[PDB]
Amino acid sequence: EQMIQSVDRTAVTGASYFTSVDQSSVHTAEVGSHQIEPLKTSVDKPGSKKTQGEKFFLIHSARWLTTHALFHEVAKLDVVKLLYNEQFAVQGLLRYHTYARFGIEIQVQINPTPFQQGGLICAMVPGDQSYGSIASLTVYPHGLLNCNINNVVRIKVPFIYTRGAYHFKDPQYPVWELTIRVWSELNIGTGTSAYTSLNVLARFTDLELHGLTPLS
Amino acid sequence: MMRNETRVSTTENVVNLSNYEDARAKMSFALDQEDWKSDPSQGGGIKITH
């Protein structure tokens, strides 16, 4: 009397989101094993979500002149919408998913010559540039530029929204709205250059994705 | 089944004269390969090596 072992047919096999329920299956026949490389051909750490999703991106720039009056708005941009573009590396994850929950890091860079004078303001505003006073923008999380002291500010903010998550392919209303106002006017003399450039850097923090979709 | 192989290297059959290790002989005219002892009997003990 013997006992003949047979093939396995009905089980839950496959990937996580692709459940292959089969009435007929076979044992996996594959040779070898995963060898390590003692003489490595790439000395950098391999790619993942941590090294691709959270990385500073140049999304928009402006330029600050001497002829802009008081309280003029230099740059008015949507932070979330400009990140969603093919030219950045974060497109490869957000294109195939639907909902997301995230935080925003902002970095602003300018370069004054020490012959000039003036200042700016960079405040992250949620939802709307509504009827709130321009003179009280310092209640918002902001940073003050000044041609005497410093040329780089940075802002970190949590997630403030009225729903569960953001929807990329059909947005309700923009979550964050960055704004840059002329806090004091720019004054030069004779022969001093009448402009300085501006830059805005941005990245996500704590990106969480849900519900991958097949549609492009 | 003997197995002894030696590769013949370069500088074959070359006479060197500079040092002593390659200037010395390989065979002798003398019978029975004999050697000679010391005899300081007629020199008065004066022997020069330097």
């Binding site: 990385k55 330029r63 000039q116 | -």
Partner: protein
């Protein structure tokens, strides 16, 4: 031989004018220890780096390279540069990359003024083959064997704002050295000035 290779020598030279727009590409660098472009007239000679006169005698090379950028400003200029590294080989079409498109690649910024004046930039090893061949002995091209791991781009990230009684350009020297370097399979070959 690492007594020669681990010491930085001058390789390249480029100015930073005050009349460039934001996103203008200043200088491209193929990433290899065979790169050098300086020369002199009296006497007639083609200058060499210390790193190029070690690796010009080997068929293969491997390891991380260290670029050192040294600026020479006054105390009163201001502006920011953007160094960018694109992985690949010595021939791709690289000037279509816009300034926003360069942030996908690994990059770093530099502030001109301050008390520091040297940026040490360590390039990682990104390749598909363990060793990268020397090809400059040969004459024809062939897809698959190369001399580089990619190229480097120098952008203008912020403009040069300055007073009137100072100059209008800041010159930058480019050094060259290596770390964790390995070569084998000796030969003889005399290099030639890469005219970029």
């Amino acid at each position: 031989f690492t007594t020669w290779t681990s010491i930085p020598t001058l390789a390249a030279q480029f100015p930073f004018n005050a009349s460039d727009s934001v996103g203008q590409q200043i200088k491209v660098i193929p990433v290899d220890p065979y790169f050098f472009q300086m020369t002199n007239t009296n006497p007639d000679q083609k200058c060499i780096t210390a790193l190029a006169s070690i690796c010009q005698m080997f068929c293969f090379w491997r390891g991380d390279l260290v670029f050192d950028f040294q600026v020479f400003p006054t105390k009163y200029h201001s502006g920011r540069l953007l160094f960018c590294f694109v992985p690949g080989n010595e021939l791709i079409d690289v000037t279509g990359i816009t300034l926003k498109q360069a942030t996908t690649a690994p990059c770093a910024v530099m502030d001109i003024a301050g008390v520091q004046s040297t940026l040490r930039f360590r390039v990682p090893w990104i390749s598909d083959t363990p060793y990268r061949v020397n090809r400059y002995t040969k004459e024809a091209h062939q897809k698959g064997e190369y001399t580089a791991i990619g190229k480097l781009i120098v952008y203008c990230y912020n403009r040069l704002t300055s007073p009137s009684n100072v100059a209008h350009h800041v010159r930058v020297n480019v050094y060259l050295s290596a770390i964790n370097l390995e070569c084998f399979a000796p030969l003889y070959h005399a290099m030639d000035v890469t005219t970029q």
